[PDB]
Symmetry: D2
Subunit: 129 residues, 4 copies
């Protein structure tokens, strides 16, 4: 639609689940920092931006990436792992997965303390004139 | 006292699968950087240290953590998510999971491009019992 | 009416990935048998119906289910686990996950031999509502 | 005991988590039925045998398998997917994974309603030659 074939996470994105994610600038190493907002929770009492850290590729046309999200209002951590593609028409999307980790009190309960899921993000409304 | 009710990732660990991980120092934000070595691969032709980045907790006795590992010898990314516990006797272990992301060329193949797994790390050479 | 606050797997479904599934009749125990067709594979040389066996609930309004799919043209097994919901308007969907198991030759490679994913199915041949 | 290159699930097994599983006889199609007992739960108020159903391979030396477990004391379903191996010495083990599915009330909560994990089973107390 405007680009021919290029993906960069720097900017902002929004997910079909309602979650939003914002990324400033990725370092030459490939690491990056960000701010992540969730619209759905197991206990939504005080959802805040969860700081994120991780790494992305920028060699391929549509590379893989991944990052941790460290919660603020409840002790937990969630990693995300996926790829950014370009549909037929020159439209950009992120097809990713996630993994949530509960904060148990015994090693005998680690088994239930894990949770996997899926997520799809897209470029937030850039609008036009 | 040391070794009894306190987990810090700073130092070195070793995994039952053969993989080793080394972490320098975790920042006051809770983020950290590191060097990760794998002993098993889908294509082991030139395994190197894969730079890692992420975040850990240090509030609880046995908190949750998580981090990305960005590959060098093949384009991929793998996140890790788990908790560090203290067994009955006062021994420290890491019970974690992982998630690998393949670098596809079409959005119609993202489905197979994900892979989940499990991993267990321990303190590399402590004392005895 | 047949449609209204009620989901039953017996009949046929189709997935957004292009895969299709057909289920005859579920037993009073809750077990059921079926025929499953995949449109995407790691090696698509001779895709056939993969026999399926498993169990479903029919107590709730939109219950959970799950089943194994035993491959024919390549030795593997894949389980599916999800729930059948009813959107706002009264429409039925299946939001499920899957898990694929490769047929390794050593216990030292079980780690890579697992694969998780997501899938969404709907009623094949729907009307306007 | 008289196996060192042959796996059959028919009999009984025990898991490192404390869960036990029992399987009668696998049908020539490759399907089977069984009784599964859990030692750990998210709400252990009345753990019972959960009926299981699924399919296994018996072509390879150490094949893959998989099956559903339909809960009795709480509405849920859990599939298992793994492989049975033979360690160096001629000892049999099952390295598998699991996936749990919660029984949500809205399609907007399917995201948290999934849970993945790992499990390892071994032959229960075998008799001598």
């Amino acid at each position: 639609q405007t680009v021919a074939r290029k993906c960069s996470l720097t900017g902002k994105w929004t997910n079909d689940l309602g979650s939003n994610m914002t990324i400033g600038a990725v370092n030459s190493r490939g690491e990056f920092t960000g701010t992540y907002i969730t619209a759905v929770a197991d206990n939504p009492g005080n959802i805040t931006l969860s700081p994120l850290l991780g790494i992305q590729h920028k060699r391929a046309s549509q590379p893989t990436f991944g990052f941790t999200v460290n919660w603020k209002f409840s002790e937990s951590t969630t990693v995300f792992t996926g790829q950014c593609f370009i549909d037929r028409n020159g439209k950009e999307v992120l097809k990713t997965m996630w993994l949530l980790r509960s904060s148990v009190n015994d090693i005998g309960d680690d088994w239930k303390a894990t949770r996997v899921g899926y997520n799809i993000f897209t470029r937030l409304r850039t609008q036009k004139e």
